[PDB]
A = this chain, B = another copy of it.
Amino acid sequence: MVKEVNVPDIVEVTEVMVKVGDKVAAEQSLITVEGDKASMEVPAPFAGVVKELKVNVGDKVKTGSLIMIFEVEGAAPAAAPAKQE
């Protein structure tokens, strides 16, 4: 503003910034319960037999979808046969 002076050594600008403090995880869900660590094993609801698989190993799962289907018919099959051709 006052008294002539040389130009600044730098003046260029950038919009890259860091990518570690970035945040995108939000909404697209809403309504939660409490919380949980991470990995958690799950048990079967009822005894059954794997007749047809729906999901293959390596395929992530989602809440609300299916995984497998069982067919319970009275007493479970058990007499003697176990290994044969």
**Residue A50 lies at the interface, judged by CB distance under 8 Å to chain B:** yes
Chain B residues within 8 Å of A13, by CB: none
Q: Which of B23, B49, B62 contacts A44 (CB 8 A)?
A: B62
Main secondary structure, interface of A, reads loop
Q: Is the CB of B48 within 8 A of A61?
A: yes
Q: Is the CB of B68 within 8 A of A38?
A: no
Residue of B nearest to A43 (CB): B66
**Given contacts A50-B55, A55-B50, are A70 and B25 in contact (CB under 8 A)?**
no
Q: Is the CB of B58 within 8 A of A40?
A: no
A39 to B23, CA, bound (A): 44
**Residue A47 lies at the interface, judged by CB distance under 8 Å to chain B:** yes
